[PDB]
Amino acid sequence: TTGTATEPFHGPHQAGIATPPQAHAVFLGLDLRKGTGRKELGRLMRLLTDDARRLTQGRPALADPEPDLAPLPSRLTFTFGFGPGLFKAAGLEKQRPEGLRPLPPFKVDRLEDRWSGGDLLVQICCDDPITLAHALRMTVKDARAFTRVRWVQRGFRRSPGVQSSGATQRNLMGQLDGTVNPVPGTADFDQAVWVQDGPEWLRGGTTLVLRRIRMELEKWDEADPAGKEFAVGRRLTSGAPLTGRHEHDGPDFDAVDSAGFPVIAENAHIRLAHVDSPRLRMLRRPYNYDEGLTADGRSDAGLLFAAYQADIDRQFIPVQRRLDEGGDLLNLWTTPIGSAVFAIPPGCDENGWIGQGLLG
Residues that are catalytic:
177
Which of 40, 49, 13 is closest to 352 using CA atoms? 49
Q: Please, which residue, 178 or 346, has the CB nearer to ligand HEM?
A: 178
Q: Which long-range contacts (CB under 8 A, 24 or more apart) does 54-62 make?
A: 55/134, 55/135, 55/138, 56/6, 56/7, 56/9, 56/15, 57/6, 57/9, 58/4, 58/6, 61/138, 61/142
129 binds, among ligand HEM, a copy of itself, none (CB under 5 to 8 A by kind): a copy of itself
Q: Please, which residue, 56 or 131, has the CB nearer to a copy of itself?
A: 131
Q: What is the DSSP string of 114-130?
A: GGS--SEEEEEEES-HH
178 appears as a binding residue in the annotation? yes
Only one of the segments 66-74, 136-144, 157-165, 170-178 lies at the binding site for ligand HEM (rule: CB under 6 A); that segment is 170-178
Q: ∠12-17-23 over CA atoms, to 5°?
A: 135
Among 133, 180, 317, 332, binds a copy of itself (CB under 8 A): 133
10 binds, among a copy of itself, ligand HEM, none (CB under 5 to 8 A by kind): none
Which of 70, 81, 75, 80 is closest to 133 using CA atoms? 70
According to CB under 6 A, which residues from 249 to 278 bind ligand HEM? Answer: 251, 269-270, 273-274
Among 27, 230, 289, 305, binds ligand HEM (CB under 6 A): 305
284 appears as a binding residue in the annotation? yes
Which of 351, 340, 347 is closest to 102 using CA atoms? 340
Which of 282, 339, 291, 289 is closest to 315 using CA atoms? 282
User: According to the binding rule CB under 6 A, does residue 299 interact with ligand HEM?
Assistant: no
Which of 305, 337, 341, 307 is closest to 155 using CA atoms? 305
Only one of the segments 117-125, 130-138, 255-263, 267-275 lies at the binding site for a copy of itself (rule: CB under 8 A); that segment is 130-138
Strand partners, 155: 25
Among 185, 250, 260, 292, binds a copy of itself (CB under 8 A): 292
CA 162 to mean position of chain CA atoms: 22
338 appears as a binding residue in the annotation? no
232 appears as a binding residue in the annotation? no
Using N-to-C axis directions, what is the helix angle for 129-143 and 38-55, rounded to 10°? 160
Among 40, 51, 177, 216, binds ligand HEM (CB under 6 A): 177
User: According to the binding rule CB under 6 A, does residue 301 interact with ligand HEM?
Assistant: no
Put residue 136 in one of left, alpha, beta given phi > 0 → left and psi -120 to 50 → alpha: alpha
User: According to the binding rule CB under 6 A, does residue 303 interact with ligand HEM?
Assistant: yes
H/E run at residue 308? strand 299-309
Q: What is the CB neighbour count within 10 angstroms for residue 20?
A: 10
Q: Please, which residue, 59 or 137, has the CB nearer to ligand HEM?
A: 137
Among 25, 45, 173, 264, binds ligand HEM (CB under 6 A): 173
Strand partners, 209: 307, 341
Binding flags for a copy of itself, 170-189, as an x/- string (CB under 8 A): x-xxx---------------
Q: Are 122 and 18 in contact (CB under 8 A)?
A: no
User: According to the binding rule CB under 6 A, does residue 171 interact with ligand HEM?
Assistant: yes
269 appears as a binding residue in the annotation? yes
- Residues that bind ligand HEM in the complex, under the rule CB under 6 A: 171, 173, 175-180, 211, 213, 215, 232, 234, 251, 269-270, 273-274, 282, 302-303, 305, 319-320, 323, 330, 334
Binding residues for heme b: 178-180, 269, 274, 284, 305
Q: Give the interface with a copy of itself as residue ranges (CB under 8 A).
A: 1-3, 23-24, 28, 65-69, 72, 74, 127-131, 133-134, 136-137, 140-141, 143-144, 147-150, 152, 156-164, 169-170, 172-174, 217, 220-221, 236-237, 288, 290, 292-297, 299, 301
